[PDB]
Amino acid sequence: MDFSRNLYDIGEQLDSEDLASLKFLSLDYIPQRKQEPIKDALMLFQRLQEKRMLEESNLSFLKELLFRINRLDLLITYLNTRKEEMERELQTPGRAQISAYRVMLYQISEEVSRSELRSFKALLQEEDSKCKLDDDMNLLDIFIEMEKRVILGEGKLDILKRVCAQINKSLLKIINDYEEFSKER
Numbered sequence: 478m479d480f481s482r483n484l485y486d487i488g489e490q491l492d493s494e495d496l497a498s499l500k501f502l503s504l505d506y507i508p509q510r511k512q513e514p515i516k517d518a519l520m521l522f523q524r525l526q527e528k529r530m531l532e533e534s535n536l537s538f539l540k541e542l543l544f545r546i547n548r549l550d551l552l553i554t555y556l557n558t559r560k561e562e563m564e565r566e567l568q569t570p571g572r573a574q575i576s577a578y579r580v581m582l583y584q585i586s587e588e589v590s591r592s593e594l595r596s597f598k599a600l601l602q603e604e605d606s607k608c609k610l611d612d613d614m615n616l617l618d619i620f621i622e623m624e625k626r627v628i629l630g631e632g633k634l635d636i637l638k639r640v641c642a643q644i645n646k647s648l649l650k651i652i653n654d655y656e657e658f659s660k661e662r
Contacts, residue, residue: 480533488518581655586616
C-alpha cells in the first residue's frame with residue numbers, strides 16, 4: 478500500500494469534468510480564487526495534504542469527494558471502498574465534511590440535463606442582470622458566478638428556487654429537502 482503512488486494513480490483516472498467537480502466540492506476549504514494553479518487532480522490532493530485534510534491515516538475526505546462525484550469505480554479499485562459503506566458513513570451525523578449546501582448545489586448540477594441548463598441560463602437572465610453568463614458555462618460555473626454576485630449562498634436561495642421551480646420539480650425537491658434538514662439542524 479503505497480499512499481503517494483495511490484494518489485497519483487487515482488489522479489490519472491480522473492478527467493477534466495471530475496477535476497472541475499472536485500474543485501467545486503472543495504470550495505469551502507480551498508477558496509475559489511486559490512484553485513487556479515490546481516491543474517490536475519494530484520495537485521488538488523496535494524493542497525488537501527497541505528491542509529491536513531488528506532493523509533495516509535486520514536482518507537475520509539478523499540473518499541467523500543470520490544463518492545459525491547460518483548467515481549464508485551475508483552473507490553473500489555484504489556480504496557477498496559463500497560457504495561454501501563459510504564452511504565452508511567455519510568448518513569451518520571457529523572461524518573460528512575462537505576457542507577450540505579455545497580452537496581445540494583452539486584446534486585442539482587448532476588440532475589440538470591443539457592436542455593435544462595439552457596433553460597437555467599435563460600430563466601436566470603429574467604431574474605438577474607448582475608451575472609456574466611455565456612453558452613459555454615456549465616451549471617457549476619453559473620453557481621460560482623451567482624455566488625460572486627452574492628445572489629446565491631447559504632440561506633440565500635430565493636433566486637435559485639425561482640429558477641429551478643420553472644425547470645423541474647426534481648430540482649426544487651433537492652433544494653426543499655436540504656432546507657428542511659438545515660432548519661432542523
